[PDB]
Amino acid sequence: LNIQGEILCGGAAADIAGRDFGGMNCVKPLAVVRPVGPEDIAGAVKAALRSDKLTVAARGNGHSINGQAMAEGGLVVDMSTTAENHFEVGYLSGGDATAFVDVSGGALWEDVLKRCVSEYGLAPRSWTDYLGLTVGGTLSNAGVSGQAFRYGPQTSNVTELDVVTGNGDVVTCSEIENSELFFSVLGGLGQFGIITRARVLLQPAPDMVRWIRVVYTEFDEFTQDAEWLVSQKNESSFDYVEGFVFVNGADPVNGWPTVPLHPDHEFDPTRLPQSCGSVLYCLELGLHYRDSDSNSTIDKRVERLIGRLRFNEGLRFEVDLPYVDFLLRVKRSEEIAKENGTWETPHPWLNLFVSKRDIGDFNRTVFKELVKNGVNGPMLVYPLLRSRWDDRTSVVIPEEGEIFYIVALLRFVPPCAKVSSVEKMVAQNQEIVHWCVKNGIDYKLYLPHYKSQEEWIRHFGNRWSRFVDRKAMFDPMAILSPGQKIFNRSL
Numbered sequence: 500l501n502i503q504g505e506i507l508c509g510g511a512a513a514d515i516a517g518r519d520f521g522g523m524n525c526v527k528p529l530a531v532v533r534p535v536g537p538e539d540i541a542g543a544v545k546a547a548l549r550s551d552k553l554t555v556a557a558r559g560n561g562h563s564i565n566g567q568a569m570a571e572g573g574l575v576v577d578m579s580t581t582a583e584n585h586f587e588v589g590y591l592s593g594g595d596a597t598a599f600v601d602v603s604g605g606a607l608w609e610d611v612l613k614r615c616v617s618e619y620g621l622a623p624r625s626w627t628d629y630l631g632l633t634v635g636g637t638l639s640n641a642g643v644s645g646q647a648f649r650y651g652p653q654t655s656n657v658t659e660l661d662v663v664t665g666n667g668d669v670v671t672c673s674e675i676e677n678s679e680l681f682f683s684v685l686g687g688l689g690q691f692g693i694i695t696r697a698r699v700l701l702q703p704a705p706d707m708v709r710w711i712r713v714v715y716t717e718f719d720e721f722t723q724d725a726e727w728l729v730s731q732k733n734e735s736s737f738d739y740v741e742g743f744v745f746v747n748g749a750d751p752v753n754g755w756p757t758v759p760l761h762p763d764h765e766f767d768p769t770r771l772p773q774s775c776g777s778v779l780y781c782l783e784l785g786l787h788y789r790d791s792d793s794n795s796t797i798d799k800r801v802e803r804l805i806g807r808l809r810f811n812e813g814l815r816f817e818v819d820l821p822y823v824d825f826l827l828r829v830k831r832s833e834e835i836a837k838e839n840g841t842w843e844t845p846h847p848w849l850n851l852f853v854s855k856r857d858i859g860d861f862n863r864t865v866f867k868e869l870v871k872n873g874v875n876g877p878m879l880v881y882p883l884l885r886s887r888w889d890d891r892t893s894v895v896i897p898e899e900g901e902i903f904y905i906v907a908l909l910r911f912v913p914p915c916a917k918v919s920s921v922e923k924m925v926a927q928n929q930e931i932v933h934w935c936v937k938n939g940i941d942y943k944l945y946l947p948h949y950k951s952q953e954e955w956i957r958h959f960g961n962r963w964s965r966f967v968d969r970k971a972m973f974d975p976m977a978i979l980s981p982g983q984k985i986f987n988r989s990l
């Protein structure tokens with residue numbers, strides 16, 4: 500290995516690369532690599548290829564839950580040291596997106612957002628909720644948030660990547676050049692190569708955002724309205740659709756206090772009808788607009804667009820704050836988080852896609868019964884449109900329906916809870932997964948984590964052969980991101 504950066508063994512370095520946000524694994528590698536670029540990364544890969552047991556896993560921000568970015572006794576590539584390696588904007592006359600910003604696979608989304616807006620007036624159009632995540636990390640899964648119904652997830656918003664494959668080759672790919680690789684890497688859980696650069700689409704950045712949260716007590720009403728809103732003609736309705744499932748109680752972390760947006764308007768439960776479940780549903784909406792716009796004009800447009808929603812009057816919270824605060828709103832929960840001690844404890848989260856034909860059986864038992872007291876955080880569930888997603892990528896979504904729902908229990912661990920707590924949480928996630936498999940629920944996990952081949956073959960379904968062909972082509976010794984646990988390293 501010939502590297503310009505600094506390698507670290509043991510101590511705090513190995514310690515950190517041995518932990519993640521989920522807090523359930525501490526797998527130590529032989530070393531941590533700091534690549535000053537693609538060659539240092541290819542060096543790491545090739546060392547593993549000649550070696551007897553070393554593997555190779557790129558790390559982004561560590562946000563993962565189950566150790567997918569770890570390499571027991573192998574190499575971890577600290578992509579963090581390649582973050583500022585790219586920032587080149589170009590225009591697209593091809594209609595659709597305006598420009599692009601070739602950015603490093605190691606760049607963080609929040610920093611990208613700031614620089615892009617604080618010097619150019621352009622922004623990517625498809626995001627994730629949390630921005631303290633890397634470009635390569637989210638592009639290796641899908642990158643989903645509230646703009647995906649309109650623009651697809653982040654993997655649908657890249658037009659070129661530089662990748663260091665499991666063969667050690669440093670390559671640039673797109674739909675045209677080295678295409679099978681391009682599509683393999685997108686959503687491919689780090690299995691076919693490390694993403695050092697991505698060509699991320701940019702649209703003109705909006706000025707402002709009207710942030711809305713309204714409340715429903717009836718699911719099929721909340722779900723019918725949500726589907727109706729995301730099914731509207733492009734740019735005729737909102738620019739953000741979200742929402743969750745909170746408990747029908749005062750629990751400041753699981754209940755109605757988690758709904759309002761600003762401190763001067765709180766949730767008055769005396770507006771809820773007597774015949775509502777132990778849980779209510781919030782619909783979360785975001786409308787983009789320019790600061791030159793007259794408030795009376797904007798107010799009239801919002802009423803127009805919300806005029807056909809069946810929520811409950813008197814339980815529709817809203818605020819108008821700048822596009823950038825609206826996008827870093829997750830920093831608001833990261834704060835309460837640290838203030839309450841759980842931002843630091845284990846997070847045995849649950850994330851999944853449950854197609855429309857099956858989301859119904861989910862609110863029935865899961866939300867209203869299994870986790871009716873909440874999981875100590877948000878419980879999202881917004882609809883999406885399969886049409887926006889390209890089946891050429893390595894991504895995996897439900898088998899049937901032009902509309903599927905993204906799911907995700909944002910489980911936290913109160914500082915009090917015994918360690919037995921995290922076991923019951925994991926156990927309950929496994930149970931939900933069991934309940935879905937046993938009832939033939941067409942669900943698939945997002946950020947999937949399985950420990951057996953038979954679970955991975957089922958998850959990939961008819962695309963398992965393709966996932967195997969791509970592996971045999973781009974990482975035949977199976978040295979890449981072995982922590983995903985889909986393929987075992989070569990003997």
Ligand SMILES: Cc1cc2nc3c(=O)[nH]c(=O)nc-3n(C[C@H](O)[C@H](O)[C@H](O)COP(=O)(O)OP(=O)(O)OC[C@H]3O[C@@H](n4cnc5c(N)ncnc54)[C@H](O)[C@@H]3O)c2cc1C
Binds near residue numbers: 556560561567631846
């Ligand atoms: C509270 C909370 C909220 C969340 N909200 C969202 C959300 O709104 N949207 C969303 O999409 N996700 C969300 N997630 C999941 C989260 O996005 C991921 O764990 C996180 O983005 C991982 O990102 P990372 O950048 O740290 O990379 P990693 O955790 O390191 O994960 C990416 C996988 O890719 C590999 N990898 C890392 N960098 C590269 C690279 N450059 N090239 C190739 N492979 C690489 C890793 O080894 C790993 O196997 C949330 C998680 C939590 C705990």
